[PDB]
């Protein structure tokens, strides 16, 4: 996003500028369920632009840059990565599991982490897998408001489970073994 905003006349190269672009992205960007058609109009008219107030009183608007940024999730080649996107990797993780597993993973595609908060991501990912998946199978995405905070929440859940109280390394075992103990006791 910083490089394409530079293309539009908004060059952000220092730390304050970088932190600001991240904030702009979080509030203005979306994935688009059809990149090329969305771009055809975003690149042609101000009607698909959204404004942002910069901290110094200046303003910026974002056009196709608004969706080209998250598009890298579907097209990693945008940043120089040799990859077909997060939906191909999701597809392969389902496909590479045993044949009696595949049906359950297709129906339980879980979005987690941040960036899951770009509008349309929960739906585009179901579309992209459905397009690769066999027919008959149900493809479904799980995308709760507990998105981006799901790892922390999982930590809270796990730390407090009765089924997890035997998984903790105590500060006894730790000193006898040293920190390498984590590879035997945790994961």
Partner 1 sequence: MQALLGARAKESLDLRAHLKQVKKEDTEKENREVGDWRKNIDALSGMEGRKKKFES
Ligand X SMILES: Nc1ncnc2c1ncn2[C@@H]1O[C@H](COP(=O)(O)OP(=O)(O)O)[C@@H](O)[C@H]1O
Residue 160 interaction partner, one of ligand X, partner 1, none, beta carbon < 5-8 Å per kind: partner 1
Distance CA 182, CA 187 (A): 7
Task: Give 104 or 146: the residue with its C-beta nearer to partner 1.
Answer: 146
Distance CA 71, CA 143 (A): 18
| Other C-beta atoms lying within 10 Å of the C-beta of residue 65 | 24
Minimum CB distance to partner 1, residue 123 (Å): 24
Answer for which of 25, 68, 87, 124 binds ligand X (CB under 6 A) is: 25
Size of interface with ligand X, in residues (CB under 6 A): 11
- 153 contributes a contact to ligand X by CB under 6 A: no
Answer for which of 151, 153, 157, 182 binds ligand X (CB under 6 A) is: 151
Minimum CB distance to partner 1, residue 162 (Å): 11
- 26 contributes a contact to ligand X by CB under 6 A: yes
Distance CA 21, CA 38 (A): 22
Please give the structure tokens belonging to residue 110. 């879980």
Task: Give 110 or 161: the residue with its C-beta nearer to partner 1.
Answer: 161
Q: C-alpha 180: how far from its chain's center?
A: 31
- 114 contributes a contact to ligand X by CB under 6 A: yes
Distance CA 155, CA 175 (A): 24
Distance CA 94, CA 126 (A): 13
Distance CA 143, CA 118 (A): 11
Distance CA 143, CA 132 (A): 20
- 118 contributes a contact to ligand X by CB under 6 A: yes
Task: Give 29 or 86: the residue with its C-beta nearer to ligand X.
Answer: 29
Q: Which positions touch partner 1 (CB under 8 A)?
A: 156-157, 160-161
Residue numbers of the site for ligand X (CB under 6 A)? 22, 25-26, 29, 113-115, 117-118, 148, 151
């Amino acid at each position: 996003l910083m490089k394409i905003l530079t293309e539009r006349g908004y060059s952000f190269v220092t730390t304050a500028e970088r932190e600001i672009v991240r904030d702009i992205k979080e509030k203005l960007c979306y994935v688009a369920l059809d990149f090329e058609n969305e771009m055809a109009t975003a690149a042609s008219s101000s009607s698909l632009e959204k404004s942002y107030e910069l901290p110094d009183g200046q303003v910026i608007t974002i056009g196709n840059e608004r969706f080209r940024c998250p598009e890298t999730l579907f097209q990693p080649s945008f940043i120089g990565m040799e990859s077909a996107g997060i939906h191909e990797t999701t597809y392969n993780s389902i496909m590479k599991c045993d044949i009696d597993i595949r049906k359950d993973l297709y129906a339980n595609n879980v979005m987690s982490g941040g960036t899951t908060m770009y509008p349309g991501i929960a739906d585009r990912m179901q579309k992209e897998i459905t397009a690769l998946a066999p027919s008959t199978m149900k493809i479904k995405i799980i995308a709760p408001p507990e998105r981006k905070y799901s790892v922390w929440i999982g930590g809270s859940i796990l730390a407090s489970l009765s089924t997890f109280q035997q998984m903790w390394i105590t500060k006894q075992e730790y000193d006898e073994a040293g920190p390498s103990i984590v590879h035997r006791k945790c994961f």
